[PDB]
Amino acid sequence: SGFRKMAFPSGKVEGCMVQVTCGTTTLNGLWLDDVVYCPRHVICTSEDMLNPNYEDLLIRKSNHNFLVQAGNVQLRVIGHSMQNCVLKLKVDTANPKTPKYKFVRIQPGQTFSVLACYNGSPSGVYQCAMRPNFTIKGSFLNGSCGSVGFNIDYDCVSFCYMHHMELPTGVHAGTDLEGNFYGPFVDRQTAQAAGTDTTITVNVLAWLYAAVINGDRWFLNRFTTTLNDFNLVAMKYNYEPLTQDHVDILGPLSAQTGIAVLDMCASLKELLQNGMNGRTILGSALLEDEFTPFDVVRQCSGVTFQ
Amino acid sequence: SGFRKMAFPSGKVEGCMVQVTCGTTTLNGLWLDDVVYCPRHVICTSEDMLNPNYEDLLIRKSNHNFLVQAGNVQLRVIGHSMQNCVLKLKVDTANPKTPKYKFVRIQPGQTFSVLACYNGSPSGVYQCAMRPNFTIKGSFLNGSCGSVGFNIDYDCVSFCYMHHMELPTGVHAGTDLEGNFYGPFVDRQTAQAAGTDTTITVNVLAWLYAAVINGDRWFLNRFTTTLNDFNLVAMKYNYEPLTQDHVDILGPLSAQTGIAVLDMCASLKELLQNGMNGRTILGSALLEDEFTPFDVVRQCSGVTF
Numbered sequence: 225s226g227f228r229k230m231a232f233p234s235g236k237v238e239g240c241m242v243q244v245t246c247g248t249t250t251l252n253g254l255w256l257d258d259v260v261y262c263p264r265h266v267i268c269t270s271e272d273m274l275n276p277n278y279e280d281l282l283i284r285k286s287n288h289n290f291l292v293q294a295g296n297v298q299l300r301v302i303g304h305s306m307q308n309c310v311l312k313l314k315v316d317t318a319n320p321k322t323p324k325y326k327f328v329r330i331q332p333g334q335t336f337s338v339l340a341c342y343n344g345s346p347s348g349v350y351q352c353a354m355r356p357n358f359t360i361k362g363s364f365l366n367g368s369c370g371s372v373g374f375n376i377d378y379d380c381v382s383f384c385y386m387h388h389m390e391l392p393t394g395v396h397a398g399t400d401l402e403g404n405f406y407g408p409f410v411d412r413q414t415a416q417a418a419g420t421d422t423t424i425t426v427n428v429l430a431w432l433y434a435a436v437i438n439g440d441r442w443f444l445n446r447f448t449t450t451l452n453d454f455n456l457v458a459m460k461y462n463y464e465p466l467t468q469d470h471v472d473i474l475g476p477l478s479a480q481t482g483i484a485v486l487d488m489c490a491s492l493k494e495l496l497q498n499g500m501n502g503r504t505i506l507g508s509a510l511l512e513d514e515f516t517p518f519d520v521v522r523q524c525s526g527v528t529f530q
Numbered sequence: 531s532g533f534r535k536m537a538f539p540s541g542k543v544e545g546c547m548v549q550v551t552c553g554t555t556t557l558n559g560l561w562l563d564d565v566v567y568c569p570r571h572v573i574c575t576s577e578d579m580l581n582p583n584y585e586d587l588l589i590r591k592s593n594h595n596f597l598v599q600a601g602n603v604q605l606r607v608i609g610h611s612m613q614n615c616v617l618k619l620k621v622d623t624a625n626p627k628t629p630k631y632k633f634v635r636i637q638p639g640q641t642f643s644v645l646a647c648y649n650g651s652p653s654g655v656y657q658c659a660m661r662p663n664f665t666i667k668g669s670f671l672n673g674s675c676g677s678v679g680f681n682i683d684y685d686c687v688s689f690c691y692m693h694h695m696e697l698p699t700g701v702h703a704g705t706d707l708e709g710n711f712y713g714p715f716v717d718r719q720t721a722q723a724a725g726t727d728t729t730i731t732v733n734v735l736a737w738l739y740a741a742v743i744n745g746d747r748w749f750l751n752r753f754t755t756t757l758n759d760f761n762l763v764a765m766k767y768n769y770e771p772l773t774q775d776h777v778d779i780l781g782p783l784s785a786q787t788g789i790a791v792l793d794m795c796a797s798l799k800e801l802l803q804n805g806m807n808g809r810t811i812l813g814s815a816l817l818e819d820e821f822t823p824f825d826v827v828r829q830c831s832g833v834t835f
């Protein structure tokens with residue numbers, strides 16, 4: 225019992241964090257096998273940040289310009305290439321702590337753990353979600369660039385995010401491990417703004433099923449709704465539309481609790497109308513949207529608390 | 531920018547997690563040097579848990595009865611002893627991944643990271659606080675016993691908690707690494723209940739300073755209060771008393787934000803009597819009490835491990 229915002233154990237990722245210095249810029253790199261991945265803006269000179277020509281800046285660099293530090297050992301860079309917004313530094317030593325890994329690009333609503341690093345050293349781990357506006361609400365100070373997001377499902381690390389920038393609202397933008405940004409963002413200091421964010425509806429529903437599995441039923445009601453009527457209400461509270469994919473994904477939780485998805489949808493509509501009235505759901509006075517249906521099944525038991 | 535509930539990196543602790551099986555019971559153990567620490571209730575069965583004489587149950591056990599598994603390698607138990615509610619299994623091999631460590635007992639209000647494990651395998655890490663009623667609001671399923679709580683100070687892991695049980699309200703109870711329970715709990719199948727909990731006041735204030743550092747100032751007001759007047763109000767809302775040591779601990783955050791501790795206390799007092807009025811602080815409609823003053827400084831300054 226109990227429901228917490230839980231991150232994956234970060235050990236497999238800690239053994240990959242290195243410091244990458246290029247001139248006056250220092251940030252984090254991900255050392256996997258004989259390659260160090262990091263944001264390509266490590267080659268920028270702050271002035272360059274507005275309209276950098278990364279191909280032009282990279283061509284002027286030599287291997288010895290990149291100082292890579294793994295603990296108290298300096299790695300030797302023997303090659304460098306750029307793939308989208310990520311810089312790939314070939315090093316002369318394979319990381320002996322390289323775990324089984326994959327590079328996965330995630331969709332909005334997906335959650336992952338972030339290992340926040342400064343100077344190649346891990347300082348904290350937290351759980352986050354890719355917002356529908358493609359930003360993450362992280363906790364990142366200057367020097368955190370190159371910090372990664374990941375999931376650890378069954379001994380394999382799926383790297384899904386690398387931190388690159390903070391937008392003016394305090395939210396964060398980054399890329400997958402192939403250098404493609406999530407969202408309409410660019411690694412330039414040009415005026416950029418996060419679009420209006422919305423609540424991840426399928427995740428809220430998954431968290432309402434977690435609350436039911438944990439013995440909380442106060443918010444349930446005798447009503448059902450159509451998928452279209454639910455979406456018409458949801459859009460008015462800046463909630464993402466719920467698709468038939470989402471309804472299908474919620475199927476296992478619906479079967480385990482005995483509450484049809486559209487029944488839980490009607491309970492959500494009522495919560496949006498009434499608020500909580502001084503009550504909490506899983507220790508929260510707001511509807512939580514950073515737990516996917518997969519996270520709820522993973523964390524919760526296979527026996528509901530009737 | 532940003533403020534998250536953040537746990538310490540768990541790598542140093544993951545390299546210590548092992549599986550301990552005794553009869554039909556399987557749980558987690560902490561392998562440090564040549565000793566494996568685990569809850570002593572691993573020696574119990576269905577009848578034994580009801581009224582256990584752990585000295586009597588342990589004397590009947592031999593070293594080969596304890597199956598310890600570190601990854602896919604079985605460790606050989608060469609000795610066993612009990613210290614309070616923790617079982618210490620001496621093994622033939624020192625854990626080569628043993629970090630620099632200490633066993634520390636924490637006080638209510640102090641926070642720590644929990645590495646939740648099942649079958650000696652880490653599955654999640656979360657941040658939690660020792661509640662004033664000595665329970666933790668954790669997330670544990672059957673098989674999580676032996677999962678540990680820790681903090682990191684520099685390169686040293688301070689182990690402060692080992693999970694033993696779940697109370698009927700869904701909250702959790704455990705011991706320090708010397709086997710002394712936090713709270714008036716016992717490791718037996720018997721009627722036990724968590725006492726009425728209270729809010730950790732110094733931690734709420736620390737989280738209000740984190741909100742100010744992050745640009746959330748709506749709750750600030752021109753007022754200040756005495757420590758005596760604030761404590762009268764705090765007691766009325768089931769908030770822990772704020773001491774002069776708490777005021778001193780909040781000093782650095784008071785200096786950085788320009789809001790004196792009793793100035794932030796008047797702001798907390800108004801929040802208690804009037805609520806948030808549909809507003810949020812750091813994305814929360816409730817006052818968060820699981821960030822200590824040290825956690826706030828650590829996260830709003832970037833200390834690494």
Ligand SMILES: Cn1ccc(CNC[C@@]2(C(=O)Nc3cncc4ccccc34)CCOc3ccc(Cl)cc32)n1
Nearest residue numbers: 249265268269270364365366388389390411412413531
């Ligand atoms: C010269 N240089 C190289 C690396 C850096 C490091 N700054 C890069 C920068 C950025 O967003 N950095 C930060 C990232 N995350 C949290 C932060 C918290 C506080 C301050 C800065 C943060 C700032 C300038 O605006 C941009 C535009 C685009 C991009 Cl991709 C990156 C940035 N500076």
Ligand SMILES: Cn1ccc(CNC[C@@]2(C(=O)Nc3cncc4ccccc34)CCOc3ccc(Cl)cc32)n1
Nearest residue numbers: 225555571574575670671672694695696716717718719
């Ligand atoms: C010997 N053994 C077999 C299985 C177990 C493990 N159960 C020990 C037990 C306990 O509290 N276990 C649990 C701990 N955390 C989360 C849980 C979620 C679901 C079910 C059980 C959980 C059972 C109840 O009664 C008590 C009394 C006292 C003590 Cl110290 C321990 C326990 N131990």
